[PDB]
Amino acid sequence: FEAIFGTFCNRLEWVYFLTSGLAAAAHAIKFHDLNKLTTGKMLFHVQVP
Amino acid sequence: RVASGAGLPTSRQTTIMVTKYSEKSPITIPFELSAACLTYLRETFEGTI
């Protein structure tokens, strides 16, 4: 005879964005109406000393 | 796999099945005994020292 010795599939692994250190560069924001948003802006105003 | 940005081709679900095999390596030691050893093993006689 011949013998098969266990057809075990690939052992699984997982990774998330918030569990990585790269999210320290980020500030996580979920926003449901993003498709209705063209663009955003951050206006500033500083007079010089 | 991994998601990617638009204007750029993506990956695909690819099944992978790999198969390995066993080996064969017999070994042998031929030790021998003289017939006088087998004669003196079983057949005592005369009861001497």
Side-chain angles (χ1 to χ4, degrees):
Chain A
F1 39 78
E2 64 185 23
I4 323 175
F5 284 146
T7 173
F8 210 87
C9 82
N10 181 30
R11 305 161 298 112
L12 198 48
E13 65 271 16
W14 293 92
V15 59
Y16 309 101
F17 164 66
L18 300 176
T19 193
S20 158
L22 208 56
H27 183 68
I29 287 181
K30 180 136 185 166
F31 171 50
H32 286 76
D33 288 344
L34 189 44
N35 287 113
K36 266 75 61 179
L37 169 72
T38 296
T39 177
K41 56 188 64 167
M42 295 199 56
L43 260 57
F44 294 137
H45 157 79
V46 162
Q47 38 197 11
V48 291
Chain B
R1 54 189 309 173
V2 51
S4 177
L8 180 56
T10 63
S11 67
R12 274 184 46 167
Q13 282 169 354
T14 51
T15 48
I16 283 300
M17 287 182 285
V18 80
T19 306
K20 290 164 70 64
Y21 288 82
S22 46
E23 278 297 320
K24 264 81 62 182
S25 314
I27 56 175
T28 291
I29 280 295
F31 89 106
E32 64 265 53
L33 298 172
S34 90
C37 320
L38 302 190
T39 317
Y40 277 153
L41 188 68
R42 330 185 47 176
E43 303 310 302
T44 175
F45 35 84
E46 210 55 47
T48 183
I49 311 297

